[PDB]
Predict the 3D structure of the following.
Amino acid sequence: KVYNDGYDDDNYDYIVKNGEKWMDRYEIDSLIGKGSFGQVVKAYDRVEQEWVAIKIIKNKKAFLNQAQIEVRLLELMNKHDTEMKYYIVHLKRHFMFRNHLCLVFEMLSYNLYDLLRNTNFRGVSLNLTRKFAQQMCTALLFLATPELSIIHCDLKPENILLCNPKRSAIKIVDFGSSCQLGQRIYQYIQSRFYRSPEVLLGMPYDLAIDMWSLGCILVEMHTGEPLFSGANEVDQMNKIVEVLGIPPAHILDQAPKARKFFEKLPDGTWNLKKTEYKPPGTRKLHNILGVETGGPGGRRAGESGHTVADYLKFKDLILRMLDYDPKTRIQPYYALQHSFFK
Ligand SMILES: COc1ccc(N)cc1-c1cnc(N)c(C(=O)c2cccnc2)n1
C-alpha cells in the first residue's frame, strides 16, 4: 500500500521530488540516473556551494550492504589519493536520510558512451584517445597500489565520465562492482563486451582484467564501435578469436570452461566448436584501426598526429593490453612508458 511512510516506491526506491531540501543543505534538482542499486540525482550543496551528484541507495539490506563495500573502498582511496590526482571520482560525503544511504560525489559531465553517440559512433581522434589512454593507465596504476589492489571489475565507456565537457579530463565512476584482490568468489563478472578471456574461460584472475577492458575501450573510442560486441559468451569468445586467434594451449589445457567454446582434437590441439566468423586471427587489428588507410573508415586521412607511425604505436600498445595471458599482459607502469605517450 505505502512504503517507508510514502517516501519509497514499490521497489524500494526513494520517490525523488524536484525542489526538495534535505537536512537544510542539499537542494534536489532532478533525477539524472537509475540502476539496480538505486538512483543518482543532481543536487546543490549549500554548505560547499557547488553542484553534487547524490547516490541514493535503495531501502533494502542487499543494496545497503553492497554500498558499504563501495564506501569502504572509496574512503580507502581517499586516504591514498589526497588532492585527487589519479582520476577516480571523489566521494565527498555519505549519510543516512529517511532509511536510504546517500553518497555525495562531485558533479561530473557526460560519459564516454554519450560522447561516442554524438559522433554517431565513429570515434574521436587518436590525439584525444591518447589523452584518455594516459589518464586511464594512470588510474589503473593507482588501483594497483599494493595496499589498495583494487579491481574495478566493470570498466566500460559509461563508467568513465568527463570532468568538464570543455576539458579532456576523465574520471572512473561506480565502484559498486569493485572488489580488492583476493581468493576467487565471483566468476560471472565484467560487462560482456569487455570481459577478459580468463573470466570467459573460468580461470583465476587479477587486476589484469581491467587492462583487458581498457584495450577494448580505447579501440572503441577511436573507431566508435565495440571491439568484441558479442551477444553471448560463445559469440564473445568467437569475436575475440577472430582478432587474436585461438588462445594458447597451455591456458586452454587449464581452463575449466575451455570446452564451452573449444574442442581438443585427437592430435592434442584446440579448435573452435562449431556453432559466421572469420578464421582465427584474420580480422587484424592493423586493419580495424586502418593503420595504412587513414584510420577507421578512412575518416582520419590528412589529420595531424594520425600517421602510420602514430597508428603503429597505438596498435602495439593495444595488442599488449589484449594479451591472452594475464601474467604477460602489460601493466599500468609499463603502459605509461610506451612510445604511444611520447
Ligand atoms: C551524466 O552523468 C550521469 C548520467 C547517468 C547516471 N546514472 C549517472 C551520471 C553521473 C553523473 N555524475 C556523477 N558523479 C556520477 C557518479 O558519480 C556515479 C555514476 C555511477 C554510479 N555512481 C556514481 N554519475
Q: What stands out?
A: Residues 82-88+108-342 form a domain with the Transferase(Phosphotransferase); domain 1 fold (CATH 1.10.510.10). The pocket of B6B is lined by residues 32-33, 40, 53, 55, 89, 105-108, 110, 161, 173-174 (CB under 6 Å). The CA atoms of residues 162 and 168 lie 7 Å apart.
